[PDB]
Design a protein around this ligand. Structure first.
Ligand code: JU5
Ligand SMILES: *[C@@H]1O[C@H](CO[C@@H]2O[C@@H](C)[C@@H](O)[C@@H](O)[C@@H]2O)[C@@H](O[C@@H]2O[C@H](CO)[C@@H](O)[C@H](O)[C@H]2NC(C)=O)[C@H](O)[C@H]1NC(C)=O
Ligand SMILES: *[C@@H]1O[C@H](CO[C@@H]2O[C@@H](C)[C@@H](O)[C@@H](O)[C@@H]2O)[C@@H](O[C@@H]2O[C@H](CO)[C@@H](O)[C@H](O)[C@H]2NC(C)=O)[C@H](O)[C@H]1NC(C)=O
Ligand SMILES: *[C@@H]1O[C@H](CO[C@@H]2O[C@@H](C)[C@@H](O)[C@@H](O)[C@@H]2O)[C@@H](O)[C@H](O)[C@H]1NC(C)=O
Ligand code: NAG
Ligand code: NAG
Ligand code: NAG
Length: 526
């Protein structure tokens, strides 16, 4: 219950899970607190300690604006930090099965949230069920989000960009140096993540500094080639300057700007992040990954296109209704509290909200491609169309394109389409299988017969958990014991994918083929 790590001993705590025991180490530091002269810098190496570090509580979450759009509503508030905000947030968590394993595969979770929010302490990222049920080790880290994590003056070590990515990288390396002491196999490390975390995972596939830090990869609802995932070096600079002016820190010595931004206080930086883009959307990523020339040596689309990435197996997937969650955060006529039937002209107005800098002709080409109703009468037609637009453009099509390009270089890839709507889903039914609501199934929360999930959800979560684990341990996401549908590899020819739900597990082909041809080939031209 005490473990010696390369920088000191840490005390853990024991959890009882399903008539058994998991050992939890919550809040292990892994970097020097990035405070004072360290803010905006790459994380620094943690200096040794002689005590027992008490790893018994989740540590501070990184500073972030929180979602206040639905005060008191669990659908939104379940994603807000459940631990004090602080700049002193570079901690990680380890769940180890009991008894202590001897060469366990390690699952490293990277949370998502548009690169501006999120924290490893969330209830639906609790790693104890995976450790209990499949006897893997689960690791998760906090990493700096927003401008504190991704503010970029490229080339300038005072604000080089991609600090949050380097936080993640530092944690991956902590797993390399220390997880063997916990009973884990550092040669069997699977990164998994969702949304911006999935996109983070995919950039770890392109980053040479990360190639030796993990074995395999799982990408849930995200990848770097998503339109939100990489800030241009153009946007990045115009955005730090806009931050600087809104903080009265505009100097000409760009390091003087950073030193000036360093003595502003977190909430003053946080309050101004929102306005560095002239027009934002519910998908805005004001401060995200950039081609820093360090973590990321070239535009990632080129590296993807030209085969420059770690060669290994990947597991990629998306949910049936990725886009709906964003509609009630700005789109006219939408509300979580009715069925949000919108008209044609509301739909068009919605496009102007989601595609502000897109020409009139671009916005018409979207309307044209999505408004060809099989049934002209359905009053939901435009409501569903807008969600499909938002989901295909932002998630499903970039994910498919990522998997095609990655598998063309010879590696086994598996693709899933999650289409089960949680029976506990607090959001209205019309929003469907929403962005982020497969995470609870992946982490095995429906395995706890106490918390209001159906039988069928237990069965499906149990199968997903087995498949994620077999992918991590063995590179192959099969459930071999219970006469399950075999999960085929995804090849750029047949493009077979696996659907996940309670009813039927079907092999299908060429997900959203007609919609993605518009987004991936035509639309980038406009
Ligand atoms: C104004 C703000 N509203 C939020 C939270 N929420 C609102 C709409 C749904 C979306 C989902 N979500 C939380 C759930 N979980 C999967 C992390 C995110 O965190 C998030 C934020 C920005 C993104 C940008 C591009 C792509 C995905 C994104 C996801 C955001 C924060 S500020
Ligand atoms: C590049 O920077 C300028 C400055 O942004 C403005 O000031 C910031 C501090 C912030 O408050 C933003 O909301 C502002 O927009 C941007 O130029 C402005 O453009 C918008 C309309 O596009 C408008 O507010 C003003 O006409 C412009 N202001 C100035 C001083 O020129 C510009 O949009 C930024 N981005 C790009 C891609 O050019
Ligand atoms: C669904 O609800 C939306 C959201 O607006 C409502 O306004 C509050 C007063 C309350 O009634 C809540 O349920 C919502 O927050 C409706 O959009 C509104 O529509 C009316 C009439 O068109 C208009 O006055 C408002 O500007 C709209 N608000 C917006 C666009 O934010 C919508 O009409 C409702 N749809 C259905 C089918 O009931
Ligand atoms: C670290 O914790 C030591 C023992 O704490 C034990 O665990 C917690 C959960 C409580 O149940 C406590 O009563 C247990 O004994 C302390 O003795 C020690 O002082 C702590 N160290 C620091 C630096 O806080
Ligand atoms: C763990 O497995 C690796 C190969 O994945 C092996 O080289 C190593 O010796 C093993 N360590 C143990 C069993 O302690
Ligand atoms: C001002 O900028 C120069 C480079 O133009 C840099 O060398 C110097 O360190 C900056 N001033 C301070 C006080 O850092
Ligand atoms: C396989 O089926 C058994 C019932 O025979 C069930 O208890 C078990 O949880 C299932 N395992 C998986 C991985 O689905």
């Amino acid at each position: 219950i005490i473990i010696a790590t390369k920088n000191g001993k840490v005390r853990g705590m024991q959890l009882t899970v399903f008539g058994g025991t998991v050992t939890a180490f919550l809040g292990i530091p892994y970097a020097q607190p990035p405070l004072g002269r360290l803010r905006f810098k790459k994380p620094q190496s943690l200096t040794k300690w002689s005590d027992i570090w008490n790893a018994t509580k989740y540590a501070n979450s990184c500073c972030q604006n929180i979602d206040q759009s639905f005060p008191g509503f669990h659908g939104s508030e379940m994603w807000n930090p459940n631990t004090d905000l602080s700049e002193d947030c570079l901690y990680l968590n380890v769940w180890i099965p009991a008894p202590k394993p001897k060469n366990a595969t390690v699952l490293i979770w990277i949370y998502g949230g548009g690169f501006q929010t999120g924290t490893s302490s969330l209830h639906v990222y609790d790693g104890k069920f995976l450790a209990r049920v499949e006897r893997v080790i689960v690791v998760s880290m906090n990493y700096r989000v927003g401008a504190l994590g991704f503010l970029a003056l490229p080339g300038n070590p005072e604000a080089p960009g991609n600090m949050g990515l380097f936080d993640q990288q530092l944690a991956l390396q902590w797993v390399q140096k220390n997880i063997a002491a916990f009973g884990g196999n550092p040669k069997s490390v699977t990164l998994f993540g969702e949304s911006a975390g999935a996109a983070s995972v995919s950039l770890h596939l392109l980053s040479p500094g990360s190639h030796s830090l993990f074995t395999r990869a799982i990408l849930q609802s995200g990848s770097f080639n998503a339109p939100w995932a990489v800030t241009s070096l153009y946007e990045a600079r115009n955005r730090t300057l806009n931050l600087a002016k809104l903080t009265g820190c505009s100097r000409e010595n760009e390091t003087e700007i950073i030193k000036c931004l360093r003595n502003k206080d977190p909430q003053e930086i946080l309050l101004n992040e929102a306005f560095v883009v002239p027009y934002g959307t519910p998908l805005s990523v004001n401060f995200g990954p950039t081609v820093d020339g360090d973590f990321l040596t070239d535009m990632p689309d080129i590296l993807l296109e030209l085969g420059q990435f770690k060669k290994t197996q990947i597991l990629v997937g998306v949910n049936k209704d990725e886009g709906t969650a964003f509609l009630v955060y700005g789109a006219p006529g939408f509300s979580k509290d009715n069925n949000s039937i919108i008209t044609r002209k509301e739909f068009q107005e919605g496009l102007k909200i989601f595609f502000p800098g897109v020409s009139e002709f671009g916005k018409e080409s979207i309307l044209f491609h999505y408004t060809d109703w099989v049934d002209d009468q359905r009053p939901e037609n435009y409501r569903e169309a807008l969600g499909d637009v938002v989901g295909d453009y932002n998630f499903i099509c970039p994910a498919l394109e990522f998997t095609k390009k990655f598998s063309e270089w010879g590696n086994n890839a598996f693709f899933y389409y999650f289409e089960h709507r949680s029976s506990k889903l607090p959001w209205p039914e019309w929003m469907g299988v929403m962005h982020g609501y497969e995470i609870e199934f992946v982490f095995g929360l429906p395995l706890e017969r106490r918390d209001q999930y159906t039988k069928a959800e237990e069965i499906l979560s149990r199968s997903i958990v087995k498949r994620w684990a077999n992918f991590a341990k063995y590179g192959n996401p099969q459930e071999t014991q219970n006469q399950s549908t075999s999960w085929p590899v995804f090849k750029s020819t047949e493009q077979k994918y696996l659907t996940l739900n309670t009813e039927s597990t079907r092999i299908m082909t060429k997900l959203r083929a007609q919609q993605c041809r518009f987004w991936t080939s035509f639309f980038p031209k406009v």
